[PDB]
Amino acid sequence: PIETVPVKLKPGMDGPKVKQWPLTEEKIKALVEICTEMEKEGKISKIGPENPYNTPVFAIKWRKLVDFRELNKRTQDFWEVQLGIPHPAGLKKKKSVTVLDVGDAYFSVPLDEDFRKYTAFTIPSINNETPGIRYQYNVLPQGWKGSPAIFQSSMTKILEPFRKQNPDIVIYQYMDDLYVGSDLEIGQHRTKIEELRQHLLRWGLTTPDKKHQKEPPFLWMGYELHPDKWTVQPIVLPEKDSWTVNDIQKLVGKLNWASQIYPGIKVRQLCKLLRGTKALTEVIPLTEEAELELAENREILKEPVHGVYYDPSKDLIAEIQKQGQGQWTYQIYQEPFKNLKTGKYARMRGAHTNDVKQLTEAVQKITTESIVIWGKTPKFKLPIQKETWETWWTEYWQATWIPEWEFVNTPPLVKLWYQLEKEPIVGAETFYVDAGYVTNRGRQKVVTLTDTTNQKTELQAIYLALQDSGLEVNIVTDSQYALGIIQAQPDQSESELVNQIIEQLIKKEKVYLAWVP
Amino acid sequence: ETVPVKLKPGMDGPKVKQWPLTEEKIKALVEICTEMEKEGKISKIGPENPYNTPVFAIKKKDSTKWRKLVDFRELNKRTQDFWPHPAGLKKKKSVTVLDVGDAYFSVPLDEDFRKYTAFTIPSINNETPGIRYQYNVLPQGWKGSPAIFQSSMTKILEPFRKQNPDIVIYQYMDDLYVGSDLEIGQHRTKIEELRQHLLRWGLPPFLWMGYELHPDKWTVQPIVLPEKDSWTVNDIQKLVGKLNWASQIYPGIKVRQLCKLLRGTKALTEVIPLTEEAELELAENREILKEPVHGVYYDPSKDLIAEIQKQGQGQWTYQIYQEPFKNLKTGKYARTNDVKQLTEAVQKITTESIVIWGKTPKFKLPIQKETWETWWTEYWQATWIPEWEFVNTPPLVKLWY
Ligand SMILES: CC(C)c1c(OC2CCCCC2)c2cc(Cl)ccc2[nH]c1=O
Secondary structure, three states, rough: OOOOOOOOOOOOOOOOEEOOOOOOOHHHHHHHHHHHHHHHHHOEEEEOOOOEEEEEEEEOOOOOOEHHHHHHHOOOOOOOOOOOOHHHHHHHOEEEEEEEEEOOOOOOOOOOOHHHHOOOOOOOOOOOOOOOEEEOOOOOOOOOOOOHHHHHHHHHHHHHHHHHHOOEEEEEOOOOOOEEEEEOOOHHHHHHHHHHHHHHHHOOOOOOOHHHHHHOOOOOOOOEEOOOOOOOOOOOOOOOOOOOHHHHHHHHHHHHHHHHHOOOOOOHHHHHOOOOOOOOOEEEOOOOHHHHHHHHHHHHHHEEEEEEEOOOOOOOOOEEEEEEEEEEEEEEEOOOOEEEEEEEEOOOOOOOHHHHHHHHHHHHHHHHHHHHHOOOOOOOOOOOHHHHHHHHHHHHOOOOOOOOOOOOOOOOOOOOOOOOOOOOOOOOOEEOOOOEEEOOOOEEOOOOOOOOOOHHHHHHHHHHHHHHHOOOOEEOOHHHHHHHHHOOOOEEOHHHHHHHHHHHHHHOOOOOOEOOO | OOOOOOOOOOOOOOEEOOOOOOOOHHHHHHHHHHHHHHHOEEEEEOOOOEEEEEEEEEEEEOOOOOEEEEOOOOHHHHOOOOOOHHHHHHOEEEEEEOOOOOHHHHHHHOOHHHHHHOOOOOOOOHHHOOOEEOEEOOOOOHHHHHHHHHHHHHHHHHHHHHHHOEEEEEEEEEEEEEEEEEHHHHHHHHHHHHHHHHOOOOOOOHHHHOOOOOHHHHHOOOOOOOOOEEEEHHHHHHHHHHHHHHHHOOOOOOOOHHHHHOOOOOOOOOOOOHHHHHHHHHHHHHHOOOOOOOOOOOOOOOEEEEEEEEOOOOOEEEEEEEEOOOEEEEEEEEOOHHHHHEEEHHHHHHHHHHHHHHOOOOOOOOOOOHHHHHHHHHHOOOOOOOEEEEEOOOOOHHOOO
């Protein structure tokens, strides 16, 4: 059998001493039948008065179910499952792939002797004056905290050898399923599977028969898995007349999911439908542009597009492009415009930013994503020019670095619509702002701002100046805030005011912004 | 015989998440760990160990060999204190740094602590569980290792110490600082004497290219004022701004006279001649800045903070203080790429913190975490890892350095 994993209850705590609810004699009779078999089979064992512990049991033909919540609350923490699943594009194509349903594996695995006593439960006797039978587990209880972790572990040890013996085959454990892939010839593959099924049996691990096995495609959590290709499960868009905040929220959701394979999906217009919504059942009438987006996406979706698998041999190329303000689309491929995966990036980091900065972040996301899926960073092809980048680069307070990238003249190209002068301008008028301004040339304008906030006034001032000043201007301000904001040269912002300024800024020939206490 | 070590009272073991690694690094890590296994230094562990510390593979300077780097930062923090620094060492002419991490590999770790040293070699795209281990011997990078090995270490050193008393030898985590003032040629030769004298006992590479630090030459970068021919309204304004700022440190700074040249909404470019009054006020301001503020002493019981500003063109600026504006040291650093440079700087500044105070500073990095976590290991070479947090360098502070 397999080596036991030593378990202990959480520090300072004691075993579950929980009372067994009343059980209908019809259920009592069913359990006993069930528990006898389990005992005949070794899974559990009758125990004595010794054991003060107990964990509730109830009936659900009849089925047995023990409530281990309490024991679980009292059981130590384990290095749990994995919480992280592989993404289709990370896989390499395989000729044949068969999944085995490791039947009741927790039951086929021993349980730390010293812990067995804490798994004690009680099958009440039918008649009043007589005692009820007491048992405890000798294996991994169903529904118990350590069962998956411990089951998965052992499984791996069990697989380890056969794995090294058969390098030509990879195996993926997922709870009870076990996936086996290889590039073996149908016959050969199928046999190695049986070669495997046996090795498992050598440990009482019983799997389903070939006649009853599962073969591709695989509708594995949002996906559809073919041997040579992959995709997202078919996504059907409703054709309602009346859309509820809820229906819309779901649409947008399903739409995002598509994004990783279907390029050009767009949700802006739809997302907009959510503004001011007062209830999850509230109906919202679609805007002309939402209906368009719905129809546009509807189309892109009517097309079944698939993804390819990872070819370790070939390089990874990531190509990014601007789909809208704040919107970036990218697609990673190895072979010429033959995607393994694609995706969007809307992440606006900070109230204000510029395409250069935003594009650079899109690169870091993709980078992190790739390292996680293919263990390597892709060569990027971006719509920005080295000099453009390099320029913004060196002049930004924050440090930053982009992998290996190549310029790709594929409009639009990200640029800087403006650059503050490094030196004050000679011949350009000079404004001293604070809500108003005063220039070296005698001019001035005060304005009464209603509702504004301290900082919002500072930008107004500036905005005013830009407005009234000629093509070339020098501006002095005491606001550190506004200064930072503008020095950082944004080209888009959530604040309308700021966007106005930016407009001003783009139009000017020369602008010098200076700060003074 | 293993010294029973314990975690600070009530504290549990670390459960730090493991940052994604590149296949390359994973491969390196597998080769290494597998060998440490055969040699019984580590052992695979089971699901009953919920703890985890992040690992990394870094690169050796002048070597094709990788080096496993475990971020026991959290662990060392939850690790009981153990119950010194040679001010003289910072004064030596040359300090060389050695990696004596392998010393520990020959000293068992208290069986009960071992579960806390748990770490994991992750797998690409989660296709496999992820290889788990824990240490049996003293793990490199653990705050406990130097301590426990202290005794045995002092033994090994006492002969050389008495033999070459003109040499100062400091140990810090996995590093050994060897200082002296001998001619460079001699320094390098007496080091090698030690190396083999270390071999003589048991398994020492040259950290930092096997090159020397020259602490003697380390110096504070005072604040500076633009000295120019003609002075425009702008020049002065910036000038006054900066002065005003520096005033909070050196309160002896006066601006009265300079600010007087700034009355009336003039034009940024209009050239202003300096009245003698102001001319002399500047001068005094200048002399006041010629040196660091008096009364700034190092407090061993406070955290040593280090901030860095990107100056561009490969130029960076830093400052080491414990209390705002009370800098204990300030420096510059010039080249690569933003990140590579930045890491090299961190390390430069760390090494110094040690050499000078014997403690690593807590950095404040002008960078986006995702990024740092991504490339930092590409250029890192130290055996230790400082504490660090990420920030947004104000526009002005940079202008003032
Ligand atoms: C991890 C491994 C067994 C693997 C596959 O199994 C997968 C593992 C994730 C669960 C669903 C099936 C896989 C499946 C198909 Cl359909 C095509 C290519 C594949 N290439 C592979 O390397």
